[PDB]
């Protein structure tokens, strides 16, 4: 099927450059243009530009053309966005999206770019133990965003609440809760599965 696969997370130093990729599959890559869209923590969405792999032509939002270069490699069905002269204002989630006749019908999952000189720090994952019972997972002191949380590898989806992270002393902390029935714990094993893309780390914490 049609899929645009990005990389959900990378850290880059101020002043450096970063090249993000969007690998398309499931269709004829050269027949659609690939566009890039920026979403900052509170700036709405901004169109960065597009590249037409068939012709080679890339169009740019002139507001960012001096720090942005778009390319495409038909042979590997990948579109790239390279940002240069990075500043903290460049930190955001960036999505690639396909377009031709409709609008943007399929979108990548988004890649969170963080521009900072801080080092990458994996999260410490602590289990949270206590009619109805509310369990938890504390994901503390990691950098940069994002972190994803799953319960029982996907098998447990309903009844979950994952909170947005809060920054403090230059590290993020987030929490996830999961209200499940009493007849379940502990008979049926349960586990918090945490992933921190930027450090390529995955942690499984079974409850108490």
């Amino acid at each position: 099927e049609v899929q645009l696969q990005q990389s959900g997370g990378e850290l880059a130093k101020p002043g450096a450059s970063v090249k993000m990729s969007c690998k398309s599959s499931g269709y004829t890559f050269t027949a659609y243009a690939i566009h890039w869209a920026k979403q900052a923590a509170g700036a709405g969405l901004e169109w960065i530009g597009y590249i037409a792999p068939a012709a080679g032509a890339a169009a740019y939002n002139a507001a960012f053309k001096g720090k942005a270069t778009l390319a495409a490699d038909k042979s590997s069905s990948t579109a790239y966005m390279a940002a240069a002269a990075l500043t903290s204002e460049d930190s955001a989630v960036y999505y690639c999206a396909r377009a031709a006749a409709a609008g943007a019908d399929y979108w990548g999952q988004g890649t969170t770019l963080t521009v900072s000189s801080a080092k990458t720090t994996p999260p410490s994952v602590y289990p949270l133990a206590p009619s109805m019972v509310t369990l938890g997972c504390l994901v503390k002191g990691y950098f940069p965003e994002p972190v994803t949380l799953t319960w029982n590898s996907g098998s447990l989806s309903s009844g979950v609440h994952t909170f947005p992270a809060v920054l403090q002393s230059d590290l993020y902390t987030l929490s996830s809760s999961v209200t499940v029935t009493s007849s379940p714990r502990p008979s049926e094993t349960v586990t918090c599965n945490v992933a921190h893309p930027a450090s390529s780390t995955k942690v499984d914490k079974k409850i108490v």
């Binding site: 709405g44 943007a104 133990a129």
Partner: protein, 213 residues
């Protein structure tokens, strides 16, 4: 550049009711070829934007029929009839006629539901953490409405506003409730020279405080 002015900024609506969002361009968005590339997208929490309408009024395949778009020139509207809870999120108009393409500022659609009191819980630091030298006291205020809620931390009776950070979730697509997490971080050492820990929650439901300790 074409400015896309969206109204309203926030759109609370009861389930079942109709909702309308407008978008106005600062100049015409009719393409040289006579086509108007005005689209509407929905950004649901935790997901990538999703296309609803393209070319002003054409519903994208798979979009429920309760969504419709209309308009021309510089004035466009997205209509949602019989609003459902799964419709929550930020809607954006977008013009793909003139470079640089631009998006509206967004409209956050929120479901208005019956006020519900929060469900309050508290969790002391976990053994594994303490060893480290930290002590995190966690309070969950799950499934309430509306969004506004209050929380106050008191050690053995004395408040404690510094050290406590709070995080709210977006509205829940299943029950239209909001939830929040408040975390009072203190040192492993100071955690040991204190006894009771309190977490309060003052909502709009019951005028009687919600304490867990």
């Amino acid at each position: 550049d074409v400015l896309m002015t969206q109204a309203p900024l926030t759109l609370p609506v009861s389930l079942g009711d109709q909702a309308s969002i407008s978008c106005r361009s600062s100049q015409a968005i009719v393409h040289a070829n006579g086509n108007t590339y005005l689209e509407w997208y929905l950004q649901k929490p935790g997901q990538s934007p999703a296309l609803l309408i393209y070319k002003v009024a054409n519903r994208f395949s798979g979009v429920p029929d309760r969504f419709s778009g209309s308009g021309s020139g510089t004035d466009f509207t997205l209509k949602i009839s019989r609003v459902e809870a799964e419709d929550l999120g930020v809607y954006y108009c977008f013009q793909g006629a003139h470079a640089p393409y631009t998006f509206g500022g967004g409209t956050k659609l929120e479901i208005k539901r019956a006020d519900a009191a929060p469900t309050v819980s508290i969790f002391p630091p976990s053994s594994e953490q303490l060893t480290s030298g930290g002590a995190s006291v966690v309070c969950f205020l799950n499934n309430f409405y509306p969004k506004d809620i209050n929380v106050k931390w008191k050690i053995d009776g004395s408040e404690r506003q510094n050290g406590v950070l709070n995080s709210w979730t977006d509205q829940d697509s299943k029950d239209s409730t909001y939830s929040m997490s408040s975390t009072l971080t203190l040192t492993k050492d100071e955690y040991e020279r204190h006894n009771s820990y309190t977490c309060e929650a003052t909502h709009k439901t019951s005028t009687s405080p919600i304490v867990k300790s």
